[PDB]
Amino acid sequence: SPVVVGSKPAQRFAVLYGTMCDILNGYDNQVVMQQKLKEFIEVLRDPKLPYSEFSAQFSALHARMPHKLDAQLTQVLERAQNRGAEFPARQLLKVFNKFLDDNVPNKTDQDLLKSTLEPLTSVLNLYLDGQKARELNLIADLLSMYADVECQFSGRRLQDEEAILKLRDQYKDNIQKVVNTVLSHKNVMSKNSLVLALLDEYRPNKPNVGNVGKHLRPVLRRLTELESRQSAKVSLKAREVLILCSLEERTAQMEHILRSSVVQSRYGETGWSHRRPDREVLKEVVDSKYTVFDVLTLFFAHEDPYVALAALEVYVRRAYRAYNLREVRYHDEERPYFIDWDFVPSSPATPVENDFKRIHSISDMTYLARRTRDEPIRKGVIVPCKDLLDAEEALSRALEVLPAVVNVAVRDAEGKNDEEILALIKPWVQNSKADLLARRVRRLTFICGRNDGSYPSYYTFRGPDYAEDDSIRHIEPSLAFQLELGRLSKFKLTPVFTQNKNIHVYEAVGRGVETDRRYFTRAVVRPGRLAEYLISEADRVVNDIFDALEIIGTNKTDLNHMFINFSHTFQVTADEVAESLQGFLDRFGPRGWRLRVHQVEIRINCMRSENDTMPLRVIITNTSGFVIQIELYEEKLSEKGEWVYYYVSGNAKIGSMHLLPVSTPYPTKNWLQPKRYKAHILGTQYVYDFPELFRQAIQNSWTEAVKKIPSLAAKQPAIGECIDYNELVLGDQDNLAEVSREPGMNSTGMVGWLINARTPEYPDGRKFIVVANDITFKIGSFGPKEDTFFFKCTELARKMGIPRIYLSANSGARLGLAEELMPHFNVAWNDPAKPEAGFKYLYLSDEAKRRFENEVITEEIVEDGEKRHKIITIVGAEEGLGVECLRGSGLIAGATSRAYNDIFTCTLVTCRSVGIGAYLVRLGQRAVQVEGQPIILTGAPALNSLLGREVYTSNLQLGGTQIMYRNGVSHLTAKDDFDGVTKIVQWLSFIPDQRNNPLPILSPSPDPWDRDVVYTPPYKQTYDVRWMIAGKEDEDGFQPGLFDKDSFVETLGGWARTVVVGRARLGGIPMGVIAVETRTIENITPADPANPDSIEQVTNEAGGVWYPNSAFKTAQAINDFNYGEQLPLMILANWRGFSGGQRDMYNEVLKYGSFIVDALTRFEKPIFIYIPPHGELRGGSWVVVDPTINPASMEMYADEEARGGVLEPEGIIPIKYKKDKQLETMARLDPVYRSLKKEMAKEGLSKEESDNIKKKMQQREELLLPIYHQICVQFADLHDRAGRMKAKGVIRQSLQWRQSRRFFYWRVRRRLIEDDILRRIEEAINPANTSLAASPETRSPHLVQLESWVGIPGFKTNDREVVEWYEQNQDRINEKLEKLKKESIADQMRELXXXXXXXXXXXX
Hints:
This protein starts with 7 loop residues before the first helix and ends with a helix. The chain is α/β, with parallel strands linked by helices. It has an eight-stranded mixed β-sheet, with helices on both faces. A seven-stranded mixed β-sheet has the order 7-8-9-10-11-12-13, with helices on one face. Helix 16 runs antiparallel to helix 17 (279-286). GO terms for molecular function: acetyl-CoA carboxylase activity; ATP binding; biotin carboxylase activity; metal ion binding. It comes from Chaetomium thermophilum (strain DSM 1495 / CBS 144.50 / IMI 039719) (Thermochaetoides thermophila).
């Protein structure tokens, strides 16, 4: 069949709209959605279509009514087709109205014409508006057609089509329409894909916010209400477009500004053309809030060569904003592009990290750190190319004006070239591999300008061969500082496609470990508005990321993060922003939770503080499945020249990440363990694992206490919350600061924590400091930073009063030499040919001398005619090589010595503790040693090398447990690192939470106070005195001691076991215990391997005697229970004197004996000396323990059946009851001896007769002598009896061992409280003993005042009655205190010529 010459595009337009009409109306016609849509857009844009639609219809209508009109219309069409392009639609309207409805007489006899020319009239009307407006007509029709059918299904509660059909019963015309609308809804899936493809095509609403945009504004707003699940996705897309409803008009705006820049008016002059572009006008574009890069890409292009220059200026000034300005030079060569700009503030600028003097690039976080004094400026070059092939000529010729950073623009938005464009830019860089290299340029960018508002694609080549870093893509090597990326350094990053060019998603996998697979998002937002704006801007950019993470998928990701940088300097403060944050996070949260996103970081600026920015970075983490991790920071520099994370958040400062650089490289997965490994090879836990060891130990302290003591158990604080620690790291002004940061990454070789542990004694909490060395951080050696640290912790624990715990694992002081001077120093020999012939000295070359000078003290002496700088002393730049470490070591040494005498001090040998470390163990006095860790002074191989022979092999052979516990350096032996902590937390249970705080007393509970002491020692043989303290575990039942069942903890019992020391509880009251071992113990000292003859020496320390080592043990213990611990004491005095044996005398027995007396005068808390049953206290022993030493705190008691005299009754008898004295008493009691005495006295008997009486008596006296001897022994023993002691007032009372417990419980408690009341009396009176009579009933002069305040008659006695009075009248004494406090104020103010000065001081 024949066809019309020009009807191809008309017929092709009428089918491509029809192939889309069938899908929207719900018919089966399914044809390729993307291709037929683009073909419809390509037939609405061609100027031939209006003519084509006319030529088809008019051909049949030529032979219609009055031809007069038919011919005149044809003339217009034919002329407009060749001459000019656009269709004369409006001319064709005018001619038809004039002839048809207007020329009623001739043209239209009757109203027939209207119907005939109707198809032509429906052509000149769709084109009257225009050709592109005809395109918009058939996109205000297909974007209304969808809404028309779908809205009813999302309509007035009708979600059912059948219910809808019954509702439709209303319209007659809807008879056919009922089914048509139902047919459409069924195939909505195909419809959604068509509308979405149409919404994406007209999405460049940003460029044209009028032609394609305003025309579509109302017919698109009728597409956001469709929230219904089916249309949900399409409604969201509609919203995107509306937000956009500028660049088309901006094309004009910027074009004008560039041209206005060129020729400055300055009316009254002929030639402004030559004048280069002016800042004032161009400034408007460069500093604008709007995106400029989005359109600018076409202006360097196809324009006047001068305008191309002006555009290049706009671009440079906008991007290199953070950078500095310096001479813009435009040269006009073959390619008029040549913009030569020169210039980085790097310290007070953008939040960056600067150490010493250094300046780095935006992308290159490592340029040249050395310094920027001997470094060039970075010469710029930006070229506008037209084609990709032609671009090469703007490279080889471009580079010639470079004696740095270079940018290259293009004009071919033809296609979205990827990989092929990368294969089209790489042949130009590999060819000029020496050309770009010679000029020393680091960065090269390639901008590709798209005309439909698509953000241009950037490709950057960096390094020596310029391998092209895939990291910087579709973004500028300037916008890059804002992208950071220097935080994902420990990750192999590879980016993935993003629909939005602002956002860049990166695949990150740990450099060491590949398991860690995370999607890190990096976005830079440019807020282009003309406080609620930024929070609404956050919703737009986070939604963009959520939709992009959707298409890439959640896949397999452990964690996901997204960074959103705000280029805006808005006036707000974080306090209100913290409330608005809460609002949108609960909505986005569930979506972010599916994508496996764990945290989000927002970096905003706040001009309102100064009217200068306060950059507030905020991290929101979804931890434990809970957020609440809303940490609001502040970008402030640490003084150290670095920008740190100073948070003033809302999660109550118990947060994470604090006072940390902005350059942290987001720690990966597993980075924690290799560190653990190096500690574990040494048999010690990694330092940061210890806080949790303590938690389990406290957890354990409760689980046992709840058993023994029920009821008082419910205050248990679960598994967690047992302890509440926070790290310690040196502050700004070297003043320790509480930080709650991630474990590991310690700044120094020492770490500390402030722990608030809820112990069962202090269930509300108790604090203490824990200091430990990182054995991984340089062998755990003691450098100056480590020393300054340790000190400031000691200082802190002291300030409070809370105990200190040191965990030792070190290698003495630090080691090093000057490494830098090793491959530079020269030698001056006696003879240069034979260097073995001795060397004169060591010198340094003049050129190598200037390199250091301050690192070496060099003297000048000319030898061989050379300027030789002989080294007279080496200094070295680095710290920790000599004396610097020793100075610090001595300081902390002193600090620990001072701390021991003030607060509770304790150390733990978790691993090898050498040199200084070893001493801090002793200065720490109270120490626990783990079975496989030595306290060594000098290295075991170092000793062998010095002696010349292999004597010692093990560091334990001289530092181990078998030495330090057996000599009293170690107080206890722990099987493992935890066992240590366990036994320590145990000591802590005996000690008050603070310094001058009441003891950790409990209810009588495991052992009641009102029980009699069952175990009584056998008088014949020896007994384990330990049984008298805690109790004797016997075959037949269990006989308890005078202290609580299972409460005793023995210490130092491996050295001088002749005295037993420990801590125990008396009816809940904890106190110090010292007792005398009765059994003959045998300590055997080991043989020294150093002297081969030295043998193991046998020493049998017979029980109940004081030896040099026993005395020292006694003395040490007294001071230990006195300083820090502050415990009451009980001494079961049972020594019968001292060993005056030569060896023991020479072994300075007397020196340590005095040390008991010294230690006793220093004590504050009450001390009880109780001689137990069978217990003895003769001569030398008594003296060093008598209450008159410290009558203020000592109290002495003796058992009813105890003994105490000047000497043993066996010793006194040959001095005061000699043989002659026994015979005078014999001739008195014995009847036989005095009868025989009557014979010799009367005489009258011969020489043989007198011999008889002599030989009769000296036989009778020989028989009576052994029993008469024992009589005097008993007689002498009656002197050393208890009754006598109470009678001469050397003891307070005679005590029955059975009811010792019962007496002391109340006497202990009575003295505890009384002592505190008296201390309080003095604190109020002045806010600043003398005889044998010094008895505790007269220990204080206030015990007279307190006596009358109480009102109890038997005050000095009836201990129980007294205690109970204080407890009741705690208010009445606080009444007396304040009375006296104001009375003492009156005395000091009255005591204050000096009156005339006071009458001047008052006037002031």
